[PDB]
Swiss-Prot record, chain A:
Effect noted on mutating residue 118 to A/K: Does not affect association with KAT8 target protein
Residues of the full protein shown: 75 to 496 of 529
Stretch list, region NLS binding site (minor): 241-329
Location(s) in or outside the cell: Cytoplasm; Nucleus; Endoplasmic reticulum membrane; Golgi apparatus membrane
Residue ranges the record marks as coiled coil: none
Family (UniProt): Belongs to the importin alpha family.
Tissue: Expressed ubiquitously.
Top-rank taxon: Eukaryota
Full protein name: Importin subunit alpha-1
Presence of the UniProt keyword DNA damage in the record: no
Transcription regulation among keywords: no
Domain notes: Consists of an N-terminal hydrophilic region, a hydrophobic central region composed of 10 repeats, and a short hydrophilic C-terminus. The N-terminal hydrophilic region contains the importin beta binding domain (IBB domain), which is sufficient for binding importin beta and essential for nuclear protein import. The IBB domain is thought to act as an intrasteric autoregulatory sequence by interacting with the internal autoinhibitory NLS. Binding of KPNB1 probably overlaps the internal NLS and contributes to a high affinity for cytoplasmic NLS-containing cargo substrates. After dissociation of the importin/substrate complex in the nucleus the internal autohibitory NLS contributes to a low affinity for nuclear NLS-containing proteins.
GN (gene name): KPNA2
PTM annotation: Ubiquitinated. Deubiquitinated by USP22; leading to stabilization and increased activity.
From Swiss-Prot, chain B:
Domain notes: Consists of an N-terminal domain (NTD) and two tandem RNA recognition motifs, RRM1 and RRM2, followed by a C-terminal glycine-rich region.
Name of this chain's protein: TAR DNA-binding protein 43
Motif Nuclear localization signal in this chain: 3-19
Highest rank taxon of the organism: Eukaryota
Residues of the whole record sequence present: 80 to 102 of 414
Function according to Swiss-Prot or TrEMBL: RNA-binding protein that is involved in various steps of RNA biogenesis and processing. Preferentially binds, via its two RNA recognition motifs RRM1 and RRM2, to GU-repeats on RNA molecules predominantly localized within long introns and in the 3'UTR of mRNAs. In turn, regulates the splicing of many non-coding and protein-coding RNAs including proteins involved in neuronal survival, as well as mRNAs that encode proteins relevant for neurodegenerative diseases. Plays a role in maintaining mitochondrial homeostasis by regulating the processing of mitochondrial transcripts.
Cross-link (Glycyl lysine isopeptide (Lys-Gly) (interchain with G-Cter in SUMO2)): 5, 16, 23
Illness association: Amyotrophic lateral sclerosis 10: A neurodegenerative disorder affecting upper motor neurons in the brain and lower motor neurons in the brain stem and spinal cord, resulting in fatal paralysis. Sensory abnormalities are absent. The pathologic hallmarks of the disease include pallor of the corticospinal tract due to loss of motor neurons, presence of ubiquitin-positive inclusions within surviving motor neurons, and deposition of pathologic aggregates. The etiology of amyotrophic lateral sclerosis is likely to be multifactorial, involving both genetic and environmental factors.
Complex and partners: Homodimer. Homooligomer (via its N-terminal domain). Interacts with BRDT. Binds specifically to pyrimidine-rich motifs of TAR DNA and to single stranded TG repeated sequences. Binds to RNA, specifically to UG repeated sequences with a minimum of six contiguous repeats. Interacts with ATXN2; the interaction is RNA-dependent. Interacts with MATR3. Interacts with UBQLN2. Interacts with HNRNPA2B1. Interacts with ZNF106. Interacts with CNOT7/CAF1. Interacts with CRY2.
UniProt lineage: Eukaryota, Metazoa, Chordata, Craniata, Vertebrata
Length: 422, 23
């Protein structure tokens, strides 16, 4: 437990062993859980010294201790990561990826993951310095099972950080170069590797449908569905996020998700005790019911309409908002028979109950769904039965009250409903 | 187009932004 002044004195001697002992003391200081003095180390001007120690190939202990200290600094705030980058760390760490000592190259992998995970500019700067080739060369083995578990986990985490941010998305060539290794990791039997691979895939599918397509042409959708059915929440959460992202794309990409059997997992996801799982599953469902009529029919055939009724009836309010979206998308794109089936499953009462929520968008969504169901009833000539059913559930007075809402869209929708069917 | 991508619901999100060693 040295002081920062003693560390500085040790570093500023011209003595390689004294420097090594000071750097180790700095590593131990920066490794404590109780408020490590990162800012004091930075203000003392130590980062350039650590970076120059990264290149002392004759003294691998000081390479290791410097890499560890710098990794700890790069794990802090954006200002601290920037101080590491501004000391010249990025190319020095990329050079260290070639070290024959696994603990040293692992430390460089970790450091580059922290720098890249700071944000899209540093991720792109790490890519521009050429990290991807040596990172992938570390995984160029026929069977991933021959690598050390912790080493493989660190590489997967760092690779997922190179995929992470969105404004801008990572360069296409970088994604293309990383994707085969990412798919390998997505098939590797280690829960942490699986979780981090899934997160990477979820990042790469969040965006325009072209990015989704380049993910789905690798054939990962069946493995995502398999992981969707896992028992570990850290795996299910990113797998579900990735599936949800894919079903925001074209109808063919959504169909790839359906053909893999995703819908059979959804009864448990839509009843999962973890509210975030229920919310994301309902969001995914809402994007599937925004699809073609045969895809709505697949939702119906899997028995999922009663689960949508249930989550609309009782759930966290955000999950209920997602369920309202699912119902409006269903009623907008569904056949008359599908809409009749939805009403037969009991959607009217939970819709009316939610009409009392304070959120303006959910009210607009519910009114749009009611209008769509009324249009289906018109096509069937049963508008009066629908009006009676809505009144019996206490929705008539709610719409009557809403026709004097502060919002113009609510105004017009409720007024049109009252004037046309009531 | 009734499909809603991410950032149309909630926020960007994610996990494991940075990791310290602490070994």
């Amino acid at each position: 437990n040295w002081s920062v002044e003693d560390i500085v004195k040790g570093i500023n001697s011209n003595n390689l062993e004294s420097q090594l002992q000071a750097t180790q003391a700095a590593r131990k200081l920066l490794s404590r859980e109780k408020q490590p003095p990162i800012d004091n180390i930075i203000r003392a001007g130590l980062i350039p010294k650590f970076v120059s120690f990264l290149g002392k190939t004759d003294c691998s202990p000081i390479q290791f201790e410097s890499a560890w200290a710098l990794t700890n600094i790069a794990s802090g705030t954006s200002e601290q990561t920037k101080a590491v980058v501004d000391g010249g760390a990025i190319p020095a760490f990329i050079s260290l990826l070639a070290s024959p000592h696994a603990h040293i190259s692992e430390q460089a992998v970790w450091a580059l993951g922290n720098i890249a995970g700071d944000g899209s500019a540093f991720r792109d700067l790490v890519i521009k310095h050429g990290a991807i080739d040596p990172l992938l060369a570390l995984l160029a083995v026929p069977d991933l099972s021959t690598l050390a578990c912790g080493y493989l986990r660190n590489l997967t985490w760092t690779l997922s950080n190179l995929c992470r941010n969105k404004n801008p998305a990572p360069p296409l060539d970088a994604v293309e170069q990383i994707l085969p290794t990412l798919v390998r990791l997505l098939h590797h039997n280690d829960p942490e590797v699986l979780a981090d691979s899934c997160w990477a895939i979820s990042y790469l599918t969040d965006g325009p449908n072209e990015r989704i397509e380049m993910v789905v042409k690798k054939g990962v959708v069946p493995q995502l569905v398999k992981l969707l059915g896992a028992t570990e929440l850290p795996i299910v959460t990113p797998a579900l996020r990735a599936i949800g992202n894919i079903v925001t794309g074209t109808d063919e990409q959504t169909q790839k998700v359906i053909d893999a059997g995703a819908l059979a997992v959804f009864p448990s996801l839509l009843t999962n005790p973890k509210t975030n799982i229920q919310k994301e599953a309902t969001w995914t469902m809402s994007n599937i019911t925004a699809g073609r009529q045969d895809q709505i029919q697949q939702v119906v055939n899997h028995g999922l309409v009663p689960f949508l009724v249930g989550v609309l009836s009782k759930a966290d309010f955000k999950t209920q908002k997602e369920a309202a979206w699912a119902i409006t998308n269903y009623t907008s794109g569904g056949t008359v028979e599908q809409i009749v089936y939805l009403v037969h499953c009991g959607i009217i009462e939970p819709l009316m109950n939610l009409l009392s929520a304070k959120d303006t968008k959910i009210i607009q969504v519910i009114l749009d769904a009611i209008s769509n169901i009324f249009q289906a009833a018109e096509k069937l000539g049963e508008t009066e039965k629908l009006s009676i059913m809505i009144e019996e559930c206490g929705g008539l007075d709610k719409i009557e009250a809403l026709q004097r809402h502060e919002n113009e869209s609510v105004y017009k929708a409720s007024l049109n409903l009252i004037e046309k069917y009531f | 187009d009734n499909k809603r991508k991410m950032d149309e619901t909630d926020a960007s999100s994610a996990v494991k932004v940075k990791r310290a060693v602490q070994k």
